[PDB]
Each structure stands twice: as structure tokens, then as C-alpha cells.
Amino acid sequence: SMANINDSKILSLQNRKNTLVDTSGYNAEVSEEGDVQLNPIFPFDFKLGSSGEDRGKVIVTQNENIVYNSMYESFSISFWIRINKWVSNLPGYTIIDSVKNNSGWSIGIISNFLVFTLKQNEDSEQSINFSYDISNNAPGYNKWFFVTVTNNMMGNMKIYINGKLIDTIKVKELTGINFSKTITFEINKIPDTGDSDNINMWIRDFYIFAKELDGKDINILFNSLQYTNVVKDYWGNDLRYNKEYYMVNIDYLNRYMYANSRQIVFNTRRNNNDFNEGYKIIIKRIRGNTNDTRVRGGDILYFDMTINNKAYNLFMKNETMYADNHSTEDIYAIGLREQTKDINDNIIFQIQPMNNTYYYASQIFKSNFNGENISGICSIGTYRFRLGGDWYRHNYLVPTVKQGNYASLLESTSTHWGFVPVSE
Ligand SMILES: CC(=O)N[C@H]1[C@H]([C@H](O)[C@H](O)CO)O[C@@](O)(C(=O)O)C[C@@H]1O
Numbered sequence: 001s002m003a004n005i006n007d008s009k010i011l012s013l014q015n016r017k018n019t020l021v022d023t024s025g026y027n028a029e030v031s032e033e034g035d036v037q038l039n040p041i042f043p044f045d046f047k048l049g050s051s052g053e054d055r056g057k058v059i060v061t062q063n064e065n066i067v068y069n070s071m072y073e074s075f076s077i078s079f080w081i082r083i084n085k086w087v088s089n090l091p092g093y094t095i096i097d098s099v100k101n102n103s104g105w106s107i108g109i110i111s112n113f114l115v116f117t118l119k120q121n122e123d124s125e126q127s128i129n130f131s132y133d134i135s136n137n138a139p140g141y142n143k144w145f146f147v148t149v150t151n152n153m154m155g156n157m158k159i160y161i162n163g164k165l166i167d168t169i170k171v172k173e174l175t176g177i178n179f180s181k182t183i184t185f186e187i188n189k190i191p192d193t194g195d196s197d198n199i200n201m202w203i204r205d206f207y208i209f210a211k212e213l214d215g216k217d218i219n220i221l222f223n224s225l226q227y228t229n230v231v232k233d234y235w236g237n238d239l240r241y242n243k244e245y246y247m248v249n250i251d252y253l254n255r256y257m258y259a260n261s262r263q264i265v266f267n268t269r270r271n272n273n274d275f276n277e278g279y280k281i282i283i284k285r286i287r288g289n290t291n292d293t294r295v296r297g298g299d300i301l302y303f304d305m306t307i308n309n310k311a312y313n314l315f316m317k318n319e320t321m322y323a324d325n326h327s328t329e330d331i332y333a334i335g336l337r338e339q340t341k342d343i344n345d346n347i348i349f350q351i352q353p354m355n356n357t358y359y360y361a362s363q364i365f366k367s368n369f370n371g372e373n374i375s376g377i378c379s380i381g382t383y384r385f386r387l388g389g390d391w392y393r394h395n396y397l398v399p400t401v402k403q404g405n406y407a408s409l410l411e412s413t414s415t416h417w418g419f420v421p422v423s424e
């Protein structure tokens, strides 16, 4: 139902033909100053940085009449945004500003909050915010998310994140508020809080609507702006074949991947503020869309890991498993085996996207070559092994495949796997 949603669209800031333009039909003027990077590939975002006098600035100047006839009753503002590195102690930055003469609206970030503000005058404002979960984001909330703010002078001001309502407040009397026709994208530090690291901000598809969109329409909009079958890396960018990742289990983000006697094991991270420990995997395609190197749901694939200059495949072992109390029926360890000339069945997996409001992840199923026989799901658990010279069995946290009726595990977060791109 996009046709009806789009009827009220009054600004549609998009990258078309390597140029930022308003495609809504109201012909807002758009200019760039400083360092503004345009992405030539989907999602065609623009990137701004915070440091230097030559930092990027994107200025949108709307038709003043469309503003006047739209903003004073009800409106919605939507856009995709990414911040790196959005650490929990971030100082204050205004990032998207529509304030002139001490009135208008503005969006800023501080600590773990993204804040939307109606500014009535120099002495009066009303704000709402999204705050990310710090305990689950020590490396920073550096992922793409979809913001939608809605306002109704006769009702509430709301902010949604990835299509989910996060904050709502009754709008107070804002008599005399004056909406500016100008919107300025630029990362501007607030000086009285009262030299930090540069941050980057990426933006794409910044829309404004002259109606208050409801939750249902916000989600339709959310989904219309993504390829939901393209699996995403941990920051929400397209997952790629032939590229190094840190593979993580959503239930164990504080663990990195290691290996011991060809058994993969999970060790506690020493650097909680980064993803920079342990071994990396590379995803290899068996079956998928050969037009690019993007990973899609339903693709058949396998995983490589290189240790001490030897390249292995992850594979489902065929040995009995032992656990302190749990039964281990149909549970098999995932370990590492030397590559061979031909793809062996026990290295073959099938991937599916598994996203939610706070994580981009996947589920990974044990598969045969043509995907006609899906026999299990990848999980994680603590089992008894003798590794690395051990005489006695010890407990290790290891990746596993659960076969038999794996359906019972489908809703478990233990089956959710993320892929963090390696910076170096
Ligand atoms: C020894 C060997 O032939 N290795 C080849 C492997 C194996 O065929 C598969 O990993 C199955 O083990 O496939 C590659 O595409 C890879 O994964 O990098 C190229 C590599 O040269």
C-alpha cells in the first residue's frame, strides 16, 4: 500500500545519478559543501564526518509553501541512518537540523540516545528519544537503523526504530512554533556539555510526509526500503562471499572464535570494546545468484577458516557428544577439516536471514548439495572434549549442529549467527 503512503510525501531526499536530489515533485533545492561521499551502490547513502572545517554539509531548502501547508498539523519524518563509532559516552552532536530563529525541529545524538526535538522558542522545547542497549553494544551501536518520527499537534509525538514504536509523548501547547524550510545535515558538536574521535554518519532515503503515518504504514515503508532476502552483516550492510568475517553467536557476543585440535571453541574476549580477537571465516558460495557476491536466503554455501597459513573447512563431525547433564541426542560438533578438491557433504550449509529490531543475524542449516535435504540447524553449547593434550575431558563452548527434529530450536536465539566485517 505504498501508493497511498506516497500521496502525502513532500520531500524525498535521494541519490540519483550520483547527485542528491528531491524526487518528491516539490523540487526542494539541495546543495553540498565540504566532504560529502556518495555511495554508487545500493543503498546509495551519503556519508558525513565530524572532524575538520571541511566536514560535509548537505543543505535542503524546501518550498516554503509546502512547509507551511504540511508541518503545522501532522507530519512524519523517516530515514535510514548509521553512526560509527556510536560509543556509549558520545558527546553531544546535532546531526539533522531544521531550526531557525530559535524555532523548528532538530535531531541529535548524545551518549546512547538519538533525540528528536520540537523547538518552540529559545526557552521551550519538547523531546523524545531512542536509547540503545549499552550492555549489548560495548563496541558501539554501529549498525544501520530506520528512524521514523511522527507528530500530531492534536495528539502525540512518536519515534519508531525499525518499524517499532519506542517512545510516545502527548504534544504540549507549542503556540508560536515556526517551522523552517531549511534542513541541514552536518555533524556539529555541542560545545557546552560541558578532543574526541571523529565519527561518521551515513544517511539514505530521508523522507517527510504531510500526514501522521501509523504503525502499520511505517512497517510497510520500512520493508519497502530493504531487500529482506539479502543477508546482512552485523552492521546491516549486505553480507558478502569471499570476505573475512568474525562469526559470532548472538547469545555469546562476548566470545570470539578459536580452535583446538581442529575443534572450534569459543573464548572470552579480552577487548570488549572491539571485535578484533580470534579467527575469521570466509563464506564460499555453492549455489546462489552469480550476478554478484551478495549472500541471499536459500543460498547453499560452506565456510573456510585459515589458521597458521593452512586453510580448513568448517564441517559437521560425526562423533558422539558428551554433556554434563543435558542429553546430546542428534547433537554434532562443528569442527575443522583440511580442504579437498571436491566439496564434501559434511561442509555444506544453507543460510537464511534472521533480523530483528536490535540485531542483523542469520540461521544456518545443515544441507545437502542441492538443498533438498535440510537435516539440522547450527547452534552452540557446552560439551566435554579432550583437546590439546588433555588427558581428562573438559568443558568447552563449541558450535554444534542439532539434527533430528531441529524445528523445536527454530525460535532459539542460540541459533542466531552474526558476521562482523574485519576492518584490517
Ligand atoms: C585444496 C583445495 O582444492 N582448496 C580449494 C577449496 C576446496 O575445494 C573447498 O574448500 C572444499 O574443501 O575451494 C576453494 O574455492 C576455497 O574454498 O578457497 C579454493 C581452494 O583452492
Ligand SMILES: CC(=O)N[C@H]1[C@H]([C@H](O)[C@H](O)CO)O[C@](O)(C(=O)O)C[C@@H]1O
Binding pocket: 258, 259, 260, 261, 262, 263, 307, 336, 388, 389
Ligand atoms: C587447527 C587447530 O586446532 N589449531 C590449534 C593448534 C592445534 O591445537 C595444534 O597444532 C594441535 O594440537 O594449537 C594452537 O596453535 C595453540 O594451542 O597454540 C592453536 C590453534 O588454533
